[PDB]
């Protein structure tokens, strides 16, 4: 779990990249995260079948 | 073929933001079937931009 904070995050690129075979938000959408202020940030990853 | 589901209303991404989107209250049938041994050849039909 590697902790993001005090930056600015273009979300954008992100969505824009076909390489990624899923890409669903549950509580937000791709398109609006472009224009919102969060609090914290918590990047998780990992690999599994 | 993965941007079939992308056809489906009320979604999003380069093919519903930049060629083909379907309205929200969308009312009809889709239909779709592969056509790779139609109209793919080995060296790249690059016909379908």
Known sequence: ?49 | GDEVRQIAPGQTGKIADYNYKLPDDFTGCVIAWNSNNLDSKVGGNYNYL
């Open chain 1, 1 to 49: 779990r590697k902790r993001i904070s005090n930056c600015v995050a273009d979300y954008s690129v992100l969505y824009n990249s076909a390489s990624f075979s899923t890409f669903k938000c549950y509580g937000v959408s791709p398109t609006k995260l472009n224009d919102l202020c969060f609090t914290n940030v918590y990047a998780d990853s990992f690999v599994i079948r």
